[PDB]
Structure formats: C-alpha cells, structure tokens
Amino acid sequence: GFIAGLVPREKSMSFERMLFRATRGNVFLRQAVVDEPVVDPVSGEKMEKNVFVVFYSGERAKNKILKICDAFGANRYPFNEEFDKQAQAISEVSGRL
Amino acid sequence: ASRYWVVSLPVQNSAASVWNRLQEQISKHSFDTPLYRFNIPNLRVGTLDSLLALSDDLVKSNSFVESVSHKIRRQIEELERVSGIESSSLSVDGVPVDTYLTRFVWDEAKYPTMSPLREIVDGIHTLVAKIEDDLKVRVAEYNNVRSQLNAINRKQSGSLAVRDLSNLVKLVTLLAVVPTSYVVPRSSKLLYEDLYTVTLFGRVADNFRIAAREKGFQIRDFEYSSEAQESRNQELEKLVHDQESLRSSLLQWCYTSYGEVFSSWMHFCAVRVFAESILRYGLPPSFLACVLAPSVKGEKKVRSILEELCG
Amino acid sequence: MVRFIRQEAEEKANEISVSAEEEFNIEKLQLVEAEKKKIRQEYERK
C-alpha cells in the first residue's frame, strides 16, 4: 500500500509515538527538511511542518495512518508514482499560487 | 480475576536476554518469575490484513476481556459458591493458570481455526460471541432464581401481618387479635396461637367483631385458607430448590464459564502477542514470549531485561 | 517481511487460478456427461 502524506517536523515525535506498532520497523517516513514554515492548505500564516511518505501494510493500519496524517495538518499533496509528474505538479501549483 | 500481565516479547527478542532464556534460566526468572509460555504457529504466514484486523480489534478484545472478567466476578459473588475454583480447578488448557500460559495446546484447530491469523482472529471473535451467551444465560438464571426465592418464604411465620394462615386455629375467623358476653355461645377459645384468641361465636356477628377488631387488639390478616399456607410452604420449598440450583449447579456452570473465558482470554492474548511479534519480527508465526503474574518490582525487572525490545 | 506478504498475495491469486482450473475441470466433466446424455438420447432416437 501507499501511505503518501505529510508529517510535521514539529510534530515528528507525536507522529513517531502514535501507531508505533503500525510501522512494524519496515516502514520509514522520509520527512522533509521544513526549514521554512510550509504554507498550510487552509492557513496562509504557514507552519513549520514537514512532508513524510511512509509505507502502508494492512487495511486498518493504512486507515489509521491516513487519519493520523489528516490530524497532523501538515502540507500534504498526492505523491505521483513517477517523480517527474510530481515535480511538474509542484511547479504548476507554485505558478498558480 | 487477573488482568492481562503478558509482556509483548517477539521471538527474536524474548522476555529474557536470550530467546531460549525465556523458556528457562531467564533474567526475570532470577527474581523467581514463573514466566514461561510458547505459541503454536499457524498453518500459514498471516497476511498484513491479519495484523490490521488485530490492531482494529484490540479494543474489541479489551471489551470482551472486560465483559468476561465482570461476568465471572459477578457469578462468583452472587451465587456465593462459584469462587471456589482455582488455577488448577479452572484447568485452562488442561493445566493450572501458571502452567496454562506455558501450554499452547488450546491453539490447535479445536477452538481456533488453525488457519492463517486472519481466520484465527475470526475464530477468537466467534469464541467471544459464544462466551457472551454464557453471561446471558447466567443473567437469565439469576433473574429466574431471584424471582423464585423472593416469591415465597418472604412472608411472615404466622399470626402476623402476612402468611398468618400457617398459625391458624384449623363460627371463627382468622383474626389473631394481638395487643364478649352475648347470647351466642362465646364459651370457646380458638387455637390461633403461634398471638391469642378471644371468646367469640359465629351465631352473632357482633360478638366476633368485638373479639376481633371492634376495639383494642386488631385482627391480623391471614392467607384465605390453610391450603394457601400449604401452597406457600410448597412454593418456598421450590424457591429454595431453585436458589440452591442457581447457587450450586448454576454456580458450577458459572465456574466452567469462567474457566472457558480465561482460556479464551489467554488465546486472545496469545493472538495479540503473535501479532506484536509479527510487527516486531518476521511476519510468519513465531513467538518466544512468556506470561506470569509477578509483583511491581518483578515487572520492573522484566522491563530491565526486555529494554532491548520495548514499545 | 513485506516481500513475504507480497508473495502471499501472489500465491493467493495463483490459488484462485488453480481453484478456477479445478472448477473448470469439474464443469467440463459435467458438460461432457451432459454431452454423453444428449448423444445417448439422440442415438436412442435415431
């Protein structure tokens, strides 16, 4: 499964603490640097939140991961299978913004 | 009963320092811990769906364990004779509770499906659903017995407000006037004594009224006939029989249900431990954990031993 | 670990394929029993 999303750098400890057994040691989240506060999807004020993509195994575990990502509130966008498509989408989104 | 006191120890990192050390010569066992247990592997390696189902139904298993514990405690308390069971008397997995944890013979195809852990979770849920029927039957039997026992023998012992026909004197009526001359043959004394009788006769209603309730002592109410008193005594015998049934035979049934619930809780805990091991080790079924009931310092020693694999 | 679960899913698909093959073999046996029945009926009529 795919657990693409975002995990805040400030809330990194909370994300790691929550659903620890769900990760099972075979899922690693590639958190973004988030040195500059990432603009919130609903708030222009932005927050120091990173983007992390994990691996999803098990239906309930994937649902819990999605719920935790939603509760995190970090800047999350769908992750394309090809990195080129994701980069093009990022460029288009930046231009639109 | 006893709460869940099994540390989630994967096969690679067992309760003690070494995986084999958990079975014998444990660092926890150095503190005299009785921790010793094994898990029967499933037929095939459970899928990630099985782990997801276990994670989702952790709360359900907690609710089932709470229901089982509450039902067993209430059954022991109410009948007042179901508490006689012990660890060996319960015979979970055909062994005392300490040996029950070390015995995984109940993880066969009999109660669990013995299929991949996905089917094992469904089997455990079915066992819990069946166990709920035991609590329902216990509640029904308790209600029936309480209705029986309180129905009869709840009145008085005669010559009083209720059930005074048992002390009846069998022209005269059930009065038992507790704190008379006329043309009627008042020269008589009824045997309505458990109370006392007064000179009265049915030839004159005035004499009976004066001797029963006209003034002074008041007439005590009684069951209409002595046959009503006999029926009350028979119903009291039947109610005592029903209460004795609920307190001895239904208490033994409750003790058997408590043993079955303990076995089911042990099986569910073993399934949860297998899921935790699969999370913290290889997916195929493999566990080396142990279950016991040590003191708080014993739990601290267990944590010190198993700090290598901590949640 | 993860590869084990993926191989389990692939083997589940292969087992579905094998069950379909066995069901198709049973269905073919039933169909050729029906073919023998209709052949016997037509041959008796002839």
Side-chain angles (χ1 to χ4, degrees), chain A residues 1 4-5 8 22 25 32 37 41 44 58 61 71 73-74 78 87 89 95, chain B residues 1-2 10 15-16 28 34 41 46 53 84 94 96 109 112 116 123 129 140 151 158 161 176 179 185 202 205 211-212 216 228 259 270 275 282 284-285 289 293-294 298 311, chain C residues 9 13 17-18 20 31-34 38 42:
Chain B
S2 188
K28 209 202 168 184
Chain C
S17 189
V18 167
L31 259 65
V32 301
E33 171 45 42
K38 61 173 72 48
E42 193 279 329

mmCIF file of all heavy atoms in Angstrom, chain B residues 45-94, unseen atoms left out:
data_model
loop_
_atom_site.group_PDB
_atom_site.id
_atom_site.type_symbol
_atom_site.label_atom_id
_atom_site.label_comp_id
_atom_site.label_asym_id
_atom_site.label_seq_id
_atom_site.Cartn_x
_atom_site.Cartn_y
_atom_site.Cartn_z
ATOM 1 N N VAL B 45 1.639 -18.283 6.981
ATOM 2 C CA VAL B 45 2.001 -16.957 7.461
ATOM 3 C C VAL B 45 0.835 -16.003 7.256
ATOM 4 O O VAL B 45 0.292 -15.876 6.150
ATOM 5 C CB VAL B 45 3.264 -16.452 6.746
ATOM 6 N N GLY B 46 0.441 -15.326 8.331
ATOM 7 C CA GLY B 46 -0.665 -14.390 8.244
ATOM 8 C C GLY B 46 -0.314 -13.190 7.382
ATOM 9 O O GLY B 46 0.832 -12.740 7.339
ATOM 10 N N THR B 47 -1.319 -12.673 6.685
ATOM 11 C CA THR B 47 -1.128 -11.514 5.829
ATOM 12 C C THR B 47 -1.192 -10.229 6.649
ATOM 13 O O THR B 47 -1.529 -10.232 7.837
ATOM 14 C CB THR B 47 -2.181 -11.480 4.720
ATOM 15 N N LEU B 48 -0.850 -9.116 5.994
ATOM 16 C CA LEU B 48 -0.952 -7.814 6.647
ATOM 17 C C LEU B 48 -2.391 -7.511 7.044
ATOM 18 O O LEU B 48 -2.640 -6.722 7.963
ATOM 19 C CB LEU B 48 -0.407 -6.721 5.728
ATOM 20 N N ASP B 49 -3.354 -8.130 6.355
ATOM 21 C CA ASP B 49 -4.752 -7.983 6.738
ATOM 22 C C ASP B 49 -5.001 -8.539 8.134
ATOM 23 O O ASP B 49 -5.795 -7.980 8.897
ATOM 24 C CB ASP B 49 -5.653 -8.675 5.715
ATOM 25 N N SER B 50 -4.334 -9.641 8.485
ATOM 26 C CA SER B 50 -4.478 -10.191 9.830
ATOM 27 C C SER B 50 -3.951 -9.231 10.889
ATOM 28 O O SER B 50 -4.593 -9.040 11.930
ATOM 29 C CB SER B 50 -3.754 -11.535 9.927
ATOM 30 N N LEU B 51 -2.789 -8.620 10.647
ATOM 31 C CA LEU B 51 -2.249 -7.645 11.588
ATOM 32 C C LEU B 51 -3.161 -6.430 11.702
ATOM 33 O O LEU B 51 -3.382 -5.906 12.800
ATOM 34 C CB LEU B 51 -0.842 -7.227 11.162
ATOM 35 N N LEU B 52 -3.692 -5.962 10.570
ATOM 36 C CA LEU B 52 -4.629 -4.845 10.601
ATOM 37 C C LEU B 52 -5.886 -5.194 11.385
ATOM 38 O O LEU B 52 -6.381 -4.369 12.163
ATOM 39 C CB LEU B 52 -4.991 -4.429 9.175
ATOM 40 N N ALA B 53 -6.412 -6.406 11.198
ATOM 41 C CA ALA B 53 -7.591 -6.832 11.942
ATOM 42 C C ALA B 53 -7.299 -6.910 13.433
ATOM 43 O O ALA B 53 -8.133 -6.519 14.254
ATOM 44 C CB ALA B 53 -8.083 -8.181 11.418
ATOM 45 N N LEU B 54 -6.121 -7.417 13.802
ATOM 46 C CA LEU B 54 -5.751 -7.464 15.213
ATOM 47 C C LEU B 54 -5.647 -6.062 15.802
ATOM 48 O O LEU B 54 -6.123 -5.808 16.915
ATOM 49 C CB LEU B 54 -4.432 -8.219 15.386
ATOM 50 N N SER B 55 -5.034 -5.134 15.063
ATOM 51 C CA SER B 55 -4.916 -3.764 15.551
ATOM 52 C C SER B 55 -6.286 -3.119 15.720
ATOM 53 O O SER B 55 -6.542 -2.438 16.720
ATOM 54 C CB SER B 55 -4.050 -2.940 14.598
ATOM 55 N N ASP B 56 -7.180 -3.322 14.750
ATOM 56 C CA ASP B 56 -8.520 -2.749 14.841
ATOM 57 C C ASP B 56 -9.315 -3.371 15.983
ATOM 58 O O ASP B 56 -10.047 -2.670 16.690
ATOM 59 C CB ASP B 56 -9.257 -2.927 13.515
ATOM 60 N N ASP B 57 -9.182 -4.684 16.180
ATOM 61 C CA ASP B 57 -9.988 -5.379 17.174
ATOM 62 C C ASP B 57 -9.291 -5.482 18.520
ATOM 63 O O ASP B 57 -9.742 -6.247 19.375
ATOM 64 C CB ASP B 57 -10.351 -6.778 16.672
ATOM 65 N N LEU B 58 -8.172 -4.782 18.711
ATOM 66 C CA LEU B 58 -7.601 -4.672 20.050
ATOM 67 C C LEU B 58 -8.627 -4.135 21.043
ATOM 68 O O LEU B 58 -8.775 -4.665 22.151
ATOM 69 C CB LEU B 58 -6.362 -3.776 20.018
ATOM 70 N N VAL B 59 -9.349 -3.079 20.661
ATOM 71 C CA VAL B 59 -10.374 -2.521 21.541
ATOM 72 C C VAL B 59 -11.489 -3.531 21.765
ATOM 73 O O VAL B 59 -12.030 -3.646 22.871
ATOM 74 C CB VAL B 59 -10.915 -1.202 20.962
ATOM 75 N N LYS B 60 -11.860 -4.269 20.717
ATOM 76 C CA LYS B 60 -12.899 -5.283 20.860
ATOM 77 C C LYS B 60 -12.467 -6.380 21.823
ATOM 78 O O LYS B 60 -13.266 -6.851 22.639
ATOM 79 C CB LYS B 60 -13.246 -5.874 19.494
ATOM 80 N N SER B 61 -11.210 -6.810 21.730
ATOM 81 C CA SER B 61 -10.692 -7.817 22.647
ATOM 82 C C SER B 61 -10.644 -7.283 24.071
ATOM 83 O O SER B 61 -10.912 -8.020 25.025
ATOM 84 C CB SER B 61 -9.306 -8.278 22.199
ATOM 85 N N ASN B 62 -10.297 -6.006 24.233
ATOM 86 C CA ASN B 62 -10.336 -5.395 25.558
ATOM 87 C C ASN B 62 -11.750 -5.415 26.120
ATOM 88 O O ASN B 62 -11.963 -5.740 27.295
ATOM 89 C CB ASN B 62 -9.802 -3.963 25.491
ATOM 90 N N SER B 63 -12.734 -5.071 25.288
ATOM 91 C CA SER B 63 -14.124 -5.096 25.731
ATOM 92 C C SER B 63 -14.560 -6.510 26.090
ATOM 93 O O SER B 63 -15.263 -6.718 27.083
ATOM 94 C CB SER B 63 -15.031 -4.515 24.648
ATOM 95 N N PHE B 64 -14.156 -7.493 25.285
ATOM 96 C CA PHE B 64 -14.512 -8.879 25.566
ATOM 97 C C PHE B 64 -13.886 -9.350 26.871
ATOM 98 O O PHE B 64 -14.530 -10.050 27.658
ATOM 99 C CB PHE B 64 -14.080 -9.776 24.408
ATOM 100 N N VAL B 65 -12.628 -8.978 27.113
ATOM 101 C CA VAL B 65 -11.956 -9.361 28.351
ATOM 102 C C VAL B 65 -12.632 -8.708 29.546
ATOM 103 O O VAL B 65 -12.807 -9.335 30.598
ATOM 104 C CB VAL B 65 -10.461 -9.003 28.282
ATOM 105 N N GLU B 66 -13.013 -7.436 29.408
ATOM 106 C CA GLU B 66 -13.726 -6.756 30.485
ATOM 107 C C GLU B 66 -15.059 -7.437 30.765
ATOM 108 O O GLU B 66 -15.431 -7.651 31.926
ATOM 109 C CB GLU B 66 -13.938 -5.286 30.126
ATOM 110 N N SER B 67 -15.791 -7.788 29.707
ATOM 111 C CA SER B 67 -17.058 -8.487 29.874
ATOM 112 C C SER B 67 -16.855 -9.820 30.578
ATOM 113 O O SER B 67 -17.601 -10.168 31.499
ATOM 114 C CB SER B 67 -17.724 -8.691 28.513
ATOM 115 N N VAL B 68 -15.838 -10.576 30.159
ATOM 116 C CA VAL B 68 -15.583 -11.888 30.748
ATOM 117 C C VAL B 68 -15.235 -11.749 32.225
ATOM 118 O O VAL B 68 -15.759 -12.479 33.076
ATOM 119 C CB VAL B 68 -14.469 -12.615 29.974
ATOM 120 N N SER B 69 -14.346 -10.809 32.550
ATOM 121 C CA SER B 69 -13.931 -10.624 33.935
ATOM 122 C C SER B 69 -15.099 -10.184 34.807
ATOM 123 O O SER B 69 -15.298 -10.711 35.910
ATOM 124 C CB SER B 69 -12.789 -9.609 34.008
ATOM 125 N N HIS B 70 -15.888 -9.217 34.329
ATOM 126 C CA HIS B 70 -17.030 -8.743 35.101
ATOM 127 C C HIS B 70 -18.054 -9.853 35.304
ATOM 128 O O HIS B 70 -18.593 -10.022 36.402
ATOM 129 C CB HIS B 70 -17.667 -7.539 34.408
ATOM 130 N N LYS B 71 -18.334 -10.621 34.248
ATOM 131 C CA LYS B 71 -19.300 -11.707 34.356
ATOM 132 C C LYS B 71 -18.827 -12.764 35.342
ATOM 133 O O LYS B 71 -19.607 -13.250 36.166
ATOM 134 C CB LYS B 71 -19.549 -12.324 32.979
ATOM 135 N N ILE B 72 -17.544 -13.129 35.277
ATOM 136 C CA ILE B 72 -17.020 -14.145 36.184
ATOM 137 C C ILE B 72 -17.072 -13.653 37.624
ATOM 138 O O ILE B 72 -17.473 -14.391 38.534
ATOM 139 C CB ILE B 72 -15.589 -14.541 35.773
ATOM 140 N N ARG B 73 -16.671 -12.400 37.855
ATOM 141 C CA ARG B 73 -16.695 -11.860 39.209
ATOM 142 C C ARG B 73 -18.116 -11.803 39.752
ATOM 143 O O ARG B 73 -18.361 -12.171 40.908
ATOM 144 C CB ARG B 73 -16.056 -10.472 39.230
ATOM 145 N N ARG B 74 -19.067 -11.349 38.932
ATOM 146 C CA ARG B 74 -20.453 -11.281 39.375
ATOM 147 C C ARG B 74 -21.012 -12.670 39.647
ATOM 148 O O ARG B 74 -21.769 -12.866 40.604
ATOM 149 C CB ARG B 74 -21.300 -10.554 38.331
ATOM 150 N N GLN B 75 -20.656 -13.648 38.811
ATOM 151 C CA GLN B 75 -21.123 -15.013 39.017
ATOM 152 C C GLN B 75 -20.573 -15.586 40.314
ATOM 153 O O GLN B 75 -21.277 -16.293 41.044
ATOM 154 C CB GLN B 75 -20.723 -15.882 37.827
ATOM 155 N N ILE B 76 -19.306 -15.297 40.612
ATOM 156 C CA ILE B 76 -18.713 -15.772 41.858
ATOM 157 C C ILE B 76 -19.375 -15.101 43.055
ATOM 158 O O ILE B 76 -19.674 -15.750 44.065
ATOM 159 C CB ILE B 76 -17.192 -15.540 41.848
ATOM 160 N N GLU B 77 -19.612 -13.790 42.963
ATOM 161 C CA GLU B 77 -20.136 -13.045 44.104
ATOM 162 C C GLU B 77 -21.589 -13.407 44.391
ATOM 163 O O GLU B 77 -21.968 -13.630 45.547
ATOM 164 C CB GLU B 77 -19.994 -11.543 43.853
ATOM 165 N N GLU B 78 -22.421 -13.464 43.350
ATOM 166 C CA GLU B 78 -23.861 -13.620 43.518
ATOM 167 C C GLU B 78 -24.228 -14.992 44.070
ATOM 168 O O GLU B 78 -24.843 -15.090 45.138
ATOM 169 C CB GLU B 78 -24.577 -13.380 42.187
ATOM 170 N N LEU B 79 -23.864 -16.056 43.350
ATOM 171 C CA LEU B 79 -24.183 -17.403 43.816
ATOM 172 C C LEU B 79 -23.475 -17.713 45.129
ATOM 173 O O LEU B 79 -23.918 -18.580 45.891
ATOM 174 C CB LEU B 79 -23.809 -18.430 42.749
ATOM 175 N N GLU B 80 -22.370 -17.018 45.404
ATOM 176 C CA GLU B 80 -21.565 -17.122 46.622
ATOM 177 C C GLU B 80 -20.883 -18.477 46.751
ATOM 178 O O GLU B 80 -20.327 -18.778 47.817
ATOM 179 C CB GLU B 80 -22.386 -16.848 47.888
ATOM 180 N N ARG B 81 -20.905 -19.309 45.708
ATOM 181 C CA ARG B 81 -20.238 -20.602 45.730
ATOM 182 C C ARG B 81 -19.416 -20.883 44.480
ATOM 183 O O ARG B 81 -18.767 -21.934 44.412
ATOM 184 C CB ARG B 81 -21.263 -21.729 45.925
ATOM 185 N N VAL B 82 -19.423 -19.981 43.493
ATOM 186 C CA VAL B 82 -18.635 -20.171 42.279
ATOM 187 C C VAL B 82 -17.202 -19.685 42.432
ATOM 188 O O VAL B 82 -16.395 -19.863 41.509
ATOM 189 C CB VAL B 82 -19.295 -19.461 41.079
ATOM 190 N N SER B 83 -16.857 -19.075 43.569
ATOM 191 C CA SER B 83 -15.498 -18.578 43.761
ATOM 192 C C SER B 83 -14.550 -19.686 44.203
ATOM 193 O O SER B 83 -13.343 -19.449 44.336
ATOM 194 C CB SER B 83 -15.495 -17.440 44.782
ATOM 195 N N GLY B 84 -15.069 -20.891 44.440
ATOM 196 C CA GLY B 84 -14.235 -21.987 44.901
ATOM 197 C C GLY B 84 -13.228 -22.474 43.881
ATOM 198 O O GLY B 84 -12.289 -23.191 44.244
ATOM 199 N N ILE B 85 -13.403 -22.108 42.608
ATOM 200 C CA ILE B 85 -12.473 -22.547 41.577
ATOM 201 C C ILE B 85 -11.114 -21.895 41.789
ATOM 202 O O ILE B 85 -11.010 -20.779 42.314
ATOM 203 C CB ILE B 85 -13.030 -22.226 40.180
ATOM 204 N N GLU B 86 -10.061 -22.598 41.380
ATOM 205 C CA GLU B 86 -8.688 -22.129 41.489
ATOM 206 C C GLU B 86 -8.019 -22.233 40.123
ATOM 207 O O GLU B 86 -8.661 -22.549 39.116
ATOM 208 C CB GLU B 86 -7.911 -22.927 42.544
ATOM 209 N N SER B 87 -6.714 -21.954 40.091
ATOM 210 C CA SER B 87 -5.967 -22.037 38.840
ATOM 211 C C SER B 87 -5.986 -23.456 38.282
ATOM 212 O O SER B 87 -6.265 -23.667 37.096
ATOM 213 C CB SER B 87 -4.530 -21.562 39.058
ATOM 214 N N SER B 88 -5.690 -24.443 39.129
ATOM 215 C CA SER B 88 -5.752 -25.834 38.691
ATOM 216 C C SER B 88 -7.193 -26.281 38.481
ATOM 217 O O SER B 88 -7.487 -27.040 37.550
ATOM 218 C CB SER B 88 -5.050 -26.736 39.705
ATOM 219 N N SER B 89 -8.108 -25.823 39.343
ATOM 220 C CA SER B 89 -9.509 -26.213 39.217
ATOM 221 C C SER B 89 -10.118 -25.683 37.925
ATOM 222 O O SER B 89 -10.930 -26.365 37.287
ATOM 223 C CB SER B 89 -10.302 -25.723 40.428
ATOM 224 N N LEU B 90 -9.751 -24.462 37.529
ATOM 225 C CA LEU B 90 -10.197 -23.940 36.242
ATOM 226 C C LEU B 90 -9.659 -24.787 35.097
ATOM 227 O O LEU B 90 -10.361 -25.026 34.107
ATOM 228 C CB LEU B 90 -9.768 -22.481 36.085
ATOM 229 N N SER B 91 -8.413 -25.247 35.219
ATOM 230 C CA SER B 91 -7.796 -26.163 34.260
ATOM 231 C C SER B 91 -7.792 -25.576 32.851
ATOM 232 O O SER B 91 -8.148 -26.239 31.873
ATOM 233 C CB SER B 91 -8.488 -27.528 34.286
ATOM 234 N N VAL B 92 -7.390 -24.307 32.753
ATOM 235 C CA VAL B 92 -7.233 -23.685 31.445
ATOM 236 C C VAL B 92 -6.127 -24.401 30.688
ATOM 237 O O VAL B 92 -5.024 -24.605 31.212
ATOM 238 C CB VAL B 92 -6.938 -22.185 31.597
ATOM 239 N N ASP B 93 -6.425 -24.801 29.451
ATOM 240 C CA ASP B 93 -5.507 -25.593 28.629
ATOM 241 C C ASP B 93 -5.113 -26.889 29.338
ATOM 242 O O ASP B 93 -4.016 -27.420 29.150
ATOM 243 C CB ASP B 93 -4.268 -24.782 28.242
ATOM 244 N N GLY B 94 -6.024 -27.402 30.159
ATOM 245 C CA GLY B 94 -5.751 -28.627 30.902
ATOM 246 C C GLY B 94 -4.585 -28.513 31.855
ATOM 247 O O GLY B 94 -3.790 -29.454 31.983
#
